[PDB]
Design a protein around this ligand. Structure first.
Ligand SMILES: Nc1ncnc2c1ncn2[C@@H]1O[C@H](COP(=O)(O)OP(=O)(O)NP(=O)(O)O)[C@@H](O)[C@H]1O
Ligand SMILES: Nc1nc2c(ncn2[C@@H]2O[C@H](COP(=O)(O)OP(=O)(O)O)[C@@H](O)[C@H]2O)c(=O)[nH]1
Ligand SMILES: [Mg+2]
Lengths: 336, 425
């Protein structure tokens, strides 16, 4: 019961200067074709077509509101029934992941009016103001993580290093996170704008705000005067594997975080296929990113929505077939 | 008036151009140091055909001798055939193409043609009538087939009024270097046939089959086969400085030997067939070698003259002999075999008697034929080429060297059209 969507991103200006060839076509509503140039043994080049079918496929002209309406917008009428719901951002680095989740990259700033964080935090409140659901008298509170160097940090408080422990009921609890109480939608935009300004990110010329950590934004839905948890919507922005040509100026510091981004995703790649077959010991405790994402897969009231991000060009055709094959494996999953 | 500029290239061109000179300098009797010591005026009036002039019975024998690798240039300058000619015709190159037709034609071989064509522009203005261009090369090598075929086009577009002949050397599976060359073969034939007039088909498939069987030289060298081909190349050019009843100049040879509008590959025969200095041979009688010219084995091209219907049968005789028996023994063939020579030309050329004997043979002969037996030297190359090509094997040695993939297809289809052109029976 996992919905999978894919989003081809458009071609940048610099990739036109290097004369990049676009190979990803989205001809229909829910298909995609990868045009792979292949050569035979006698130097006769030919072309392969890799069809895919998803729940919904996005073009390169789609905006973040349309990506929102088909991914996280159906999952708001779930959090007000008692369940919990998440969404991933899984792909290559540079493939538009924090442009979808975080917001539109407006150069020096982050226009957080776009993004999936703000558009769902707005839509909780409109849903909370309906007379059917206003009767429950709930309290919306928001928290916001950061997973850097395998360890959990916090971004509401400045640099509170955090632990990952477990309840006796087999429930992972990060403790002690900061959980501010949100008044309105003008309050939750103040968290996200202050949150993204403190997220650890590199500084270069190609991707001046490349993600260096697996940011997790939670909106906790609590009844008033009970201190339980009635619903959670946990966003997940990943960091993305990077192992193509990342040899620019990488010192001992750059590949220190560099090999730990790739280590955290192999643990995530294994838990997908281990859930694919049956009865195996699900390696959730390998990386702490997989221990946070435990309730997304095996949750009895969990409805997730992975958004597979795709770089369009020819030089990223290798990572593209890698990334699309996992999302097809994510789609073919029946937990319970 | 009747001047000839000569040119040759390649290893096979240079391992016969030394063998070409030593035979003609002893049939004409020419001293290899630069001088001449003879007696007859048959060998003295015609000194301006190949050769220049200088005082003191000396000259410079002009022939453009060129290859890129310097090992071949230093191997044809050692002996008495070395100091015979002009040192300013020392035209060599920097890096020898390693049996690559592509480097000898487009990248590297198309660089030093200006150092070759400048020599030809100076050996043309000094003469008064240039009556040909001769060429000796191998049809499946590197600069012998690369540069030697390109220098045809550089002169044919500058001297189009000159009849050009090439002493062609077809390769063979038995004697072989750079083992696979149907790629080097048909690329060298395609630009040859479209740009030449006369083509003498010499192959090493027949020059090794004779030595395996008749001369019993089972494992020879190139120089043992260079001796065989250098005896015919004097038997051909004896109609250039030794006149006779058939005044058979190369332009007159061009008209009298080419029936169809396209050139054809000539299949020369030979005299009684031994090596150098071998005894146990009879007197070279005239009626015996009629069977030795029309033999199914005595051919310088591996063919089938029992099936190839004759077109031109011009055979030049050499040596003081009876003129009456020459006319009678030829009439034992066409008057008995109507399928061997067939009805195309009334009164075809069948004799030309020279009196000067070659150095070592008295009353010899030289058969020069042309017939449809040269199908089999087009089918054996093409069947060894179509196995190379319909799997596109060994394709990448030319495609990265500034070539085209579809130039093979024309040079394949040009050869297949020759075979269907030969069933005009
Ligand atoms: N759909 C889109 N339309 C236009 N520009 C886009 C789109 N998606 C991404 N971009 C641009 O692509 C650039 C890099 O996007 P980004 O979101 O950083 O990729 P990324 O995968 O998140 N890199 P990282 O942050 O290390 O994961 C930015 O300039 C974005 O504005
Ligand atoms: N009969 C004969 N064939 C030769 C001789 N030298 C070379 N060849 C042929 O020519 C081919 C080699 O071509 P080559 O001239 O060496 O190429 P290049 O030196 O790179 O231009 C071989 O396949 C041989 O069969 C020779 O002296 N006699
Ligand atoms: Mg990002």
């Amino acid at each position: 019961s996992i919905t999978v969507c894919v989003r081809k991103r458009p071609i940048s200006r610099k990739e036109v200067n290097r004369k990049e060839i676009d190979v990803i076509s989205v001809p229909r509503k829910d298909m995609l074709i990868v045009h792979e140039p292949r050569s035979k043994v006698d130097l006769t080049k030919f072309l392969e077509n890799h069809k895919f079918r998803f729940d919904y496929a996005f073009n390169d002209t789609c905006d973040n509101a349309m990506v929102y309406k088909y991914t996280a917008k159906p999952l708001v009428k779930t959090i007000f029934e008692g369940g919990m719901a998440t969404c991933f951002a899984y792909g290559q680095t540079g493939s538009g992941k924090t442009h979808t989740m975080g917001g539109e990259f407006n150069g020096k700033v982050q226009d957080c009016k776009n993004g999936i964080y703000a558009m769902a935090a707005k839509d909780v409140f409109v849903t909370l103001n309906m007379p059917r659901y206003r009767a429950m008298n709930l309290v919306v509170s928001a928290s916001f993580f950061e997973i850097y160097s395998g360890k959990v940090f916090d971004l509401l408080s400045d640099k509170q290093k955090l632990r990952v422990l477990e309840d006796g009921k087999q429930q992972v609890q990060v403790v002690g996170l900061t959980e501010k109480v949100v008044d309105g939608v003008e309050e939750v935009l103040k968290l996200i704008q202050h949150g993204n300004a403190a997220r650890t990110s590199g500084q270069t010329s190609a991707n001046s705000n490349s993600s260096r950590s697996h940011a997790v934004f939670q909106i906790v839905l609590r009844p008033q005067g009970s201190t339980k948890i009635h619903g959670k919507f946990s966003f997940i922005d990943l960091a993305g594997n990077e192992r193509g040509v990342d040899t620019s100026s990488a010192d001992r510091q750059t590949r220190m975080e560099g090999a730990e981004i790739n280590k955290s995703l192999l643990a995530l790649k294994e838990c997908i296929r281990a859930l694919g077959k049956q009865s195996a010991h699900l390696p959730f405790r390998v990386s702490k990113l997989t221990q946070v994402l435990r309730d997304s897969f095996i949750g009895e009231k969990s409805k997730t929505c992975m958004i597979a991000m795709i770089s369009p060009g020819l030089s990223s055709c290798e990572h593209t077939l890698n990334t699309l094959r996992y999302a097809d494996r994510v789609k073919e999953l029946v937990v319970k | 008036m009747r001047e000839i500029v000569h040119i040759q290239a390649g290893q096979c061109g240079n391992q016969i151009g030394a063998k070409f000179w030593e035979v003609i300098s002893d049939e004409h009797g020419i001293d290899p140091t630069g001088s001449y010591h003879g007696d007859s005026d048959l060998q003295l009036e015609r000194i301006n055909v190949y050769y220049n002039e200088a005082t003191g019975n000396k000259y410079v024998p002009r022939a453009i001798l060129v290859d890129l690798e310097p090992g071949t240039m230093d191997s044809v300058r050692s002996g008495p055939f070395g100091q015979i000619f002009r040192p300013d015709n020392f035209v060599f190159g920097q890096s020898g193409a390693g049996n690559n037709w592509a480097k000898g034609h487009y990248t590297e071989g198309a660089e030093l043609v200006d150092s070759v064509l400048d020599v030809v522009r100076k050996e043309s203005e000094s003469c008064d009538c240039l009556q040909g261009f001769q060429l000796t090369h191998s049809l499946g090598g590197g600069t012998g087939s690369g540069m030697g075929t390109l220098l045809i086009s550089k002169i044919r577009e500058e001297y189009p009024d000159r009849i050009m002949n090439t002493f062609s050397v077809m390769p063979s599976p038995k004697v072989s270097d750079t083992v696979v060359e149907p790629y080097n073969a048909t690329l060298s034939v395609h630009q040859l046939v479209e740009n030449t007039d006369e083509t003498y088909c010499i192959d090493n498939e027949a020059l090794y089959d004779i030595c395996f069987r008749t001369l019993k030289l089972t494992t020879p060298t190139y120089g043992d086969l260079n001796h065989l081909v250098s005896a015919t190349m004097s038997g051909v050019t004896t109609c250039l400085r030794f006149p006779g009843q058939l005044n058979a100049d190369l332009r007159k040879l061009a008209v009298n030997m080419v029936p169809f509008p396209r050139l054809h590959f000539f299949m020369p025969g030979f005299a009684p067939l031994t090596s150098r200095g071998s005894q146990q041979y009879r007197a070279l009688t005239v009626p015996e070698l009629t069977q030795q010219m029309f033999d199914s084995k005595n051919m310088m091209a591996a063919c089938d003259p029992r099936h190839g219907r004759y077109l031109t049968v011009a055979a030049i005789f050499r040596g003081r002999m009876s003129m009456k028996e020459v006319d009678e023994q030829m009439l034992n063939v066409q008057n008995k075999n109507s399928s061997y020579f067939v009805e195309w030309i009334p009164n075809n050329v069948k004799t030309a008697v020279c009196d000067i004997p070659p150095r070592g043979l008295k009353m010899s002969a030289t058969f020069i034929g042309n017939s449809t037996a040269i199908q089999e030297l087009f089918k054996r190359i093409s069947e060894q080429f179509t196995a190379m090509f319909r799997r596109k094997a060994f394709l990448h040695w030319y495609t990265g060297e500034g070539m085209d993939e579809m130039e093979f297809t024309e040079a394949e289809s040009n050869m297949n059209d020759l075979v269907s052109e030969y069933q005009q029976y």
